């Protein structure tokens, strides 16, 4: 029972997301989220508010935006890039791939660019819309969503930067090659052995640089001496310049990982590329109070950021 709670409100096909049709004639996707209060709750409110105040704060066609601002809407997204992989009897040919990597760096340059971390990009949340272009959602903080964390993370590294996001874009790449996800791990020491047989044994010295006191203590006596795998090997459909970048995007150090302006530049993107969109639609760097936490003083910010009935 959901549909029921809208009949004395406004429509009907984390939270509970559903589908309906706005005031007018439009496809809307409508999230309720009410208890687990929650909007009472100063701790969890200010989560439903760092949402809220993240996706009002960007305007642009890659970043999924408030239609209408506990009940949410937004546009509805036709289906996510997990099911277009997962579904073999859809071809993903590689002028697709170059069009959906295109657009996923895009959207992630707008968030870093405005300081924002996604910290959990994978295909689940990498959505599709009725035109068939990509927009992300889940930029605010199953078991598979593991197989996209960059080494830090696995690592859990404290200094972790916008560049986790480029790892779980350059497996999501390699995902759209081999219809199949690059390193599905289920231990902290089988999803490290994954990505090392791949992208080849890290320098000590790196690995201390990028790891918690507790994660070198898993990995002291856990010395590999693992070659470099041949990409051509490790992702078969895809051509020299689509493998060239995706070793560049899967590298195991950050410092060495190709950037988000640097991987738009990229050779592979010649065809796509314009200098002008990593510019336009961009937010400036987003604000958010997490210092201040109070009953009544969130409700008064909620009613600030919304101006649209
Ligand atoms: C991280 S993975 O479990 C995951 C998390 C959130 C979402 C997810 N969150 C939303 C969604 C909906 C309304 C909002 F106001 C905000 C987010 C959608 C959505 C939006 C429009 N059409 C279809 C679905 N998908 C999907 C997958």
């Known amino acids: 029972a959901a549909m029921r709670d809208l009949i004395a409100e406004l429509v009907q096909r984390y939270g509970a997301v559903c589908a309906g049709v706005d005031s007018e004639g439009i496809p809307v996707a409508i999230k309720r989220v009410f208890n687990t209060n929650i909007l009472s709750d100063s701790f969890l409110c200010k989560r439903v508010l760092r949402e809220i105040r993240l996706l009002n704060h960007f305007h642009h066609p890659n970043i999924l935006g408030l239609r209408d601002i506990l009940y949410l809407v937004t546009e509805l997204m036709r289906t996510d890039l997990a099911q277009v992989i997962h579904d073999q009897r859809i071809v993903i040919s590689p002028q697709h791939i ?38 992300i959602c889940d930029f605010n903080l199953y078991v598979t969503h593991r197989w996209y964390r960059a080494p830090e993370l696995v690592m859990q ?43 080849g044994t890290p320098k000590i010295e790196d690995v201390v640089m990028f790891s918690s006191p507790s994660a070198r203590d898993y990995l002291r006596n856990s010395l590999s001496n693992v ?36 991987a738009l530049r990229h050779p592979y993107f010649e065809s796509l590329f314009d200098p002008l969109d990593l510019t336009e639609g961009l937010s400036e760097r987003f604000h958010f109070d997490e210092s201040v936490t109070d009953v009544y003083d969130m409700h008064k910010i909620f009613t600030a950021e919304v101006e649209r009935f």
């Open 98 to 135: 170059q069009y959906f990597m295109y657009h996923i760096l895009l959207g992630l340059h707008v968030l870093h660019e405005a300081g924002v971390v996604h910290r959990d990009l994978h295909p689940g949340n990498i959505l599709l819309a009725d035109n068939n272009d990509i927009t």
């Open 227 to 262: 070659p470099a795998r041949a990409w051509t090997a490790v992702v078969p459909t895809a051509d020299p310049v689509a493998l060239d970048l995706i070793a560049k995007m899967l590298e195991f150090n950050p410092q060495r990982r190709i950037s988000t302006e640097q």
């Open 157 to 199: 590294f404290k200094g972790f930067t916008k560049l986790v996001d480029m790892w779980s874009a350059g497996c999501v790449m390699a995902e759209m090659f081999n219809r199949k996800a690059l390193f599905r791990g289920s231990t902290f020491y089988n999803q490290l052995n994954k990505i090392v047989e791949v992208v």
